[PDB]
Amino acid sequence: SFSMEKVKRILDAQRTEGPATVLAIGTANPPTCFYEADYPDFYFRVTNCEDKPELKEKFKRISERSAVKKRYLHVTEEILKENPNMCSYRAPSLDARHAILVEEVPKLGKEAALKAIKEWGQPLSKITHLIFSAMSGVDIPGADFRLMNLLGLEPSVNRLMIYTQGCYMGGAAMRHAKDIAENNAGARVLLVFCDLMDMYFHAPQNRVDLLVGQAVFGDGAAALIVGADPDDDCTERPLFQVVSCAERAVPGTQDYIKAHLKEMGMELHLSTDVPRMIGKNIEKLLADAVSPFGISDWNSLFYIVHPGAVAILDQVEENLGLGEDKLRASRYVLSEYGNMGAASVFFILDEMRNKSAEEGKLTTGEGLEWGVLFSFGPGLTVETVVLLSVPL
């Protein structure tokens, strides 16, 4: 009865008022830029597969239809010479690949995080939580721990490390940052995604899905600061507000995306029915998300759509009845960066906020007030994040 008064003082003390908001965004990529026109030539050469010209022409057509202009890749010609088993299909190469990633993943995360923290402008000691999402680079301690030390965070930073889960993680980790920020006054969350696709590099196979991956997977890292209740007394300024987060596993699609961690690396299996399956469901998912806020004209939203493959963007555009320019920002990131896993939606959100100011729009959301963020991954998981833009 007095111990319960202590608990209620703790609960009262932690309450927040406003919603979780994104306070800064920073991105970073490997230094090596690979242009899509040269990649079939580079890829088949460096894998000593120039004696497979029909397969090469098949890959060229997939790359040309991919709508990817360039990618920044961590895998270089030097790296493949020093670890040739990566170019020998199913040969053991997991040790070599992991040695390469274990230090580079936190290293690239740091570069993006520094940018986010710089824009944020607050001292590192104000960061209370760190969430690290990384497709590859599994290690104990994790990249969360490494980045905490590289950045000089407080040893009391609350850490969450999510390894090897898929492209739905952009929306998923965003939900957790929201729950953290809103349940804890003063909480300031550094949310970092680093997806290096080195584990998915294999010699070309006569497999459409593996070829699409080789054409589309790109590397990058994205960092955000997420918090509730911005302090006016300092230079904290919101970019977007996270209103509601939803997740759904599509029934009957277990086998559409599978990927196995093996001695040869990451073994991918991706059904070509993924975009249609996404397109068949997207409107009902959007409708469930935004009806509670009275939105029924889909073109009244601004869009951040995970660019898993260009077919995915087209399917969304088609089955939502979107104007041709609605997915401009998503197509841009797909074009300039490829599919960077979970980081992609945050490259897009970064692009949208910058393009809006550059074009003089009245909000961070292309002049609109409400928007939605979609991530897609195994199997099949769809993330639906409702956003509010901020005025300019």
Add this chain to the structure above:
Amino acid sequence: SFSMEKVKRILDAQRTEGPATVLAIGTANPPTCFYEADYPDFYFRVTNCEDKPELKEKFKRISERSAVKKRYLHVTEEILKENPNMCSYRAPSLDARHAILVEEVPKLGKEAALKAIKEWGQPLSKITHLIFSAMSGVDIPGADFRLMNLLGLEPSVNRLMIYTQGCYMGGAAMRHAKDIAENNAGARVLLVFCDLMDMYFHAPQNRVDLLVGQAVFGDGAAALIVGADPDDDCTERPLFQVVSCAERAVPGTQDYIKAHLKEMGMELHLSTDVPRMIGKNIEKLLADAVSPFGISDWNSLFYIVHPGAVAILDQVEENLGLGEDKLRASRYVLSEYGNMGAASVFFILDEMRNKSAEEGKLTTGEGLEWGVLFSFGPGLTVETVVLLSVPL
């Protein structure tokens, strides 16, 4: 300015009143019981190492000093015959191991979860969140996804899957469960830990840490339901309340615990200075956690201590001045089960609620009101979770 009013109706609707509380605990273990007396004979025979009788004596002395009576292990003699590369040191065996685990991890998680759900007594459709923590079994889709389908959870259940992180996950996943439960009215979180140590089974080496791990690591899974604001109108009934969660990386201990995922499986590195380091820091961590609640007599708390090794329990007892019976429940779980990774503290918490009832105590925390839960892992991370018991 009317849309900002829409956001406030959502937030107001999602507020909770009370703290996150654990509403049920369920545990499960593999079927095969290995007695610690017999393990040195079994272990060195089945690894064809009876020709190292001095190493076997070094292993036996560690086993006898271990304070482990028995363990339930998934690794059987049959499994090792079907996968002999698990017994040849550094031979490639990661593929063989992962195939064994990817279906067993969710299966044992299901066994524990069903019990927790049984005690909980609500319909599965009420579970809004699933958090799965597993040391081993990295797969896409994850064990969370498999478990959702094994149990028949709603496809809209919000999932979080954490692979390969260490024994601090007990307290860490508990923090995230607290944030979800408190930030989302109606939320009921299914929290599942399954750590199968098959990835750490190797031929005996003349390495103290690997031998101790071979003596102490056991297999098991523990499941919890966590929610804020228990319903009186139904059979929901709280066991403990989660008051505050803190996490700390001990400065200068990066290398004390390391583990690398390689082609041979999990390659562990564990310094013997761990218990001393833990003992050296435990009081300052405990004091920071419970001083805000006016607590300065450490024997006024009940204890759940991660049983990483008996040396750790002894160090915690010594450096806090605990009475000889304070750590009864923790040493019990170590005795009867070994070190089951992150699931352990929940076996202990389960043991404590049951022993307290069996002894007719007036609360679930051995008659005391306030208590603390400790998890330790890489590198070095310590979780301090302050608990409130419930009357009986």
